[PDB]
Design a protein around this nucleic acid. Sequence first.
RNA 1: CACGAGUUGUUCGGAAACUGAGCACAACGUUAUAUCGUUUUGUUAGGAAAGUGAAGGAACUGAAAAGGGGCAACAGAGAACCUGGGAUUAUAUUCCAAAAAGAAAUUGCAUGUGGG
RNA 2: GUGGUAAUGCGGCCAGGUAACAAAUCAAUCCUCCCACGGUGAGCUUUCUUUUCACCAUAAUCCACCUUGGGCCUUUUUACCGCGUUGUUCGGAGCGGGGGCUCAAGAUUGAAAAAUGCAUUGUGAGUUCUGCGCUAAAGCAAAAACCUGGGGU
RNA 3: AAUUGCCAACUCAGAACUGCUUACGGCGGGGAAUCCAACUGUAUAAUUAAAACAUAGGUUUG
Lengths: 47, 71, 88, 63, 112, 132, 254
Amino acid sequence: IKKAMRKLYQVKAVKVNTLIRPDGLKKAYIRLSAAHDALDTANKIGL
Amino acid sequence: PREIKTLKEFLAICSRKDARCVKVKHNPSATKFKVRCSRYLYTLVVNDKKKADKIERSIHPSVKKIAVTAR
Amino acid sequence: AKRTVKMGVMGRYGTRYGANPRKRAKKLEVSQHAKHFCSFCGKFAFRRKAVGIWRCDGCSKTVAGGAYTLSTPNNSTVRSTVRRLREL
Amino acid sequence: KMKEAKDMGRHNGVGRREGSREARMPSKELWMRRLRILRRLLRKYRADKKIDRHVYRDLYMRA
Amino acid sequence: CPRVQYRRRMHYATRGNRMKMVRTPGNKLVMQKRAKRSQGIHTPWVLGHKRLGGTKALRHIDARLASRHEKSVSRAYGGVLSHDQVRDRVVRAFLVEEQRIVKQALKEHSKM
Amino acid sequence: KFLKPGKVVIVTAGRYAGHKAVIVQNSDVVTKERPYGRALLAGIKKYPKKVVRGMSKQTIARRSQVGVFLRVVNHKHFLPTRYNVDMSKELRGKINVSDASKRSRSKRLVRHVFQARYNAGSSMWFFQRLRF
Amino acid sequence: GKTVLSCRKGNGSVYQVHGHKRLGPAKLRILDYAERHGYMRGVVKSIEHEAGRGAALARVEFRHPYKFRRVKELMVAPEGMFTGQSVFCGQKAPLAIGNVLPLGQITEGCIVCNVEAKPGDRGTLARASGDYCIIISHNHETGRTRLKLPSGQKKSVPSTSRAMIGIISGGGRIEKPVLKAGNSFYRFRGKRNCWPKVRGVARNPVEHPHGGGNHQHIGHPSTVSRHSPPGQKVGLIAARRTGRIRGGKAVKGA
RNA sequence: CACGAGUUGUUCGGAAACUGAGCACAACGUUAUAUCGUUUUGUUAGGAAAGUGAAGGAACUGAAAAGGGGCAACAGAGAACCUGGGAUUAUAUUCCAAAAAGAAAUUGCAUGUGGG
RNA sequence: GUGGUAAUGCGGCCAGGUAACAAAUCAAUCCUCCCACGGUGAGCUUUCUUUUCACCAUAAUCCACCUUGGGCCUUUUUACCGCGUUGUUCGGAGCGGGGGCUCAAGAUUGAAAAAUGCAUUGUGAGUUCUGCGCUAAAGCAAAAACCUGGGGU
RNA sequence: AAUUGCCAACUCAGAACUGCUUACGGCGGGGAAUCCAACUGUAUAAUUAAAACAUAGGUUUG
Ligand SMILES: [K+]
Ligand SMILES: [Mg+2]
Ligand SMILES: [Mg+2]
Ligand SMILES: [Mg+2]
Ligand SMILES: [Mg+2]
Ligand SMILES: [Mg+2]
Ligand SMILES: [Mg+2]
Ligand SMILES: [Mg+2]
Ligand SMILES: [Mg+2]
Ligand code: NA
Ligand code: NA
Ligand code: NA
Ligand code: NA
Ligand code: NA
Ligand code: NA
Ligand code: NA
Ligand SMILES: [Zn+2]
């Protein structure tokens, strides 16, 4: 997940926490390094 | 956390390339200089106010200084 | 003072198993909880640790013999014969 | 208030006792207290050299 | 008065799951696990099984990460036998070898 | 026993338990510093190893080296044997311990004498190790 | 009817021995070259008690004949054995309590234990608490020895089978009355599932040949034949005689 | 009942990686028939069940080691982390960001220093 | 590798040890409850009450280094008498006195740590882990993993 | 020192005065005999808990 995060969006992830949901899907919480703004990345993604 | 016994040793530690920052705590009696190195926190306890001010105003370049206050 | 007239260590059974069986078990119980003589170390130091195991805390030693006593009467004949044959 | 009264000894009579004498104050505790007191006194006297070893041993046995 | 709960997902009071009560700087009472202990380094069981002088009783990771002084002594058989056992073995070795030499020399002198 | 200088003893207590030594100097009069009878002992803390044929002279010497110690020991802490190693009055006079310098010099002299004796080939039992 | 209990026990389902706490089979040394042509010396290390057995067991340490190693054996202790004792096994052994020697070398009239029936069996006779054999005679022509077994019968064995000198330890055990059902409970908890014992006359006809009736009785003689099928062979089996014996007691056995 | 949400771990529990009462794959035997039996009292099987250390002149090659492979304990053995939070609507010894609120312990591989 | 008379400081193979194991009695630390002194807030107050209630906290991980319970060393040697427990015992196979080495559990000083939390610092009782070393014809599971030594290398 | 101070924790015993409407809860009725089984135990889940079964002790058989 870290490698894919870096490849898809040119950002660096310092932590990934994962859980599998009661409906069967897997969800990840990805924290970016302080050199990157998650708000800027979210705007680029289109959130 | 480890405690330093001498000013020379404290100066060497503060000059160590891994020393990230130096925090200064002003107690009603003594002054504590806490150096955050990579693995440990080193604290030097100084009793004399004049000596403590001399060290604080002295030069420890390239290391950030933090004044510990209640936030 | 004396605490029982004749029913000694067997006084823990109450009135419960018959006079003759208690009298028969008393001798073996007394001998099994007694302290026996140690030929080495020359003193009374042997104590039972299980049905045939006797242990002397002075010399730090364990000996095999007897269920409720250190030496059976049958073994005396064996030791006497062995010593005599060795003497010959 | 009742505790001060009972410290003066007011509500601990025959008609108020409900448990056995040994339940209220066991005898083994009394014996251990007494014997330890006596042994402490004997040791102090022997140390202060009021009595000798010969007298001490006899008193230690009779206690 | 306050009452406490288990915190480490095992809820049985066995000899390995022992707990102690602690009051924290935040003024609450919690449960903390009590570590298991060891009996220490001993003399061989057939020779008496006595605790050896100069050695420490350390558990698994502590024994792995400690230094040699803690678990041994500078004498011979350090950390295995005691001083009296070592002395007895030394004397027995010397005396037995002397008896053997004398007996063999006597046999050879009778032969020749 | 009869503790004379030149006799061979076996240490039974302490770090050097089981090693062999020679009585350099005996003294049976108690003092305030040492309230016991004692002797000065010159033992060997490193026995010469075993040498077989087909060995280079370098390794032969390296494995024929020996090492010594010089200490004062209580009478109870060694056992006396019937063997002897010759010690002269001149050698005993040259041996002494009163400071670090004197101790080191005496130790070097004792080691040299022992190496000479082992090379000469006398007193083989003294240089064999005790297996226990 | 249904299966009888003595036949149910032959499947050995819940009727097998309780052996988790046992230490292993007790046996003499292996009959090898050193024992056949000389002697070996061992030292007694410890004396222990094993659940379900009345005698003591001894741990004896030897040296491996061929490798650099130590070998520990487990035998049944004779009476008098102590820790630190030296034990000799083989041909050239002396005569003392605990030594293992051939029967041809043991003198006539001696008391032995742990006897081998066939050379190499590692001991099968006289192994319970206070038992022993007696050597009766030697016969140098055929190389056989006659003994008196603990039961009173006489048996001839080859002179090459080994035996140990002395008497087994733990004697006098059955002289103490038990007095309680709890004591029997604890005695059999270390052996096997065989206690308590119900009576055939107290069972029902579907279960036992003796069960049933308006009074508790056996309707037929309780002496049964040697050729009876399993399930019919309950009672006194192939008895030669019954009742209380008046006079001398003979030996029992074939 | 309808719609929308919620479970975050180098260290907690398990597995990776122990053995127990026990089970039964291989091998062998038996059966018209394997869908049967033996298989821990050191211990398969008439039974050739070991596949790599050091080597020397970068991988290959082969000496020494009797007794085949595996499972069975979320209460036995084993097991490197603790507090504070104004941090949720619902999770937390799992979340908190450069003054990490913070302070530690431990594993693998590398780099400098000192000693050797 | 190296100090101390010593107990014992400090820088393939083979043999042992830890893991590893009952009851009772008596007695610590932690925690809980109570009492006595103070400080802060609230309640009662026709009358009485120097009063009633609540609170006054300190995690892991680390430095330096006194008690009381075992084992031992050295010195002076014990006349069937001496030592010791609530309790069933110990002594020329080494009692007691002087001086020491070591282990287990606690205490203290400090770093953490006030920068946090909330709106003091002394007694008595009860309870755990711990220590007091280790019924029975019933006598206290095993292995991995790890530790130390003997040798050779 | 067989003397002086300072302090804790509760228990037992004795006395004078005074009162009862016998007043929470909790807590064995006792004695003399006969039958059976020695005793503690087990045991027909859902009409039988016993004098039945077990037991220690005794004897016989292979
Ligand atoms: K099968
Ligand atoms: Mg997860
Ligand atoms: Mg019926
Ligand atoms: Mg619904
Ligand atoms: Mg577990
Ligand atoms: Mg875990
Ligand atoms: Mg919740
Ligand atoms: Mg108790
Ligand atoms: Mg009845
Ligand atoms: Na009493
Ligand atoms: Na029938
Ligand atoms: Na009947
Ligand atoms: Na009948
Ligand atoms: Na198994
Ligand atoms: Na498993
Ligand atoms: Na019924
Ligand atoms: Zn003895």
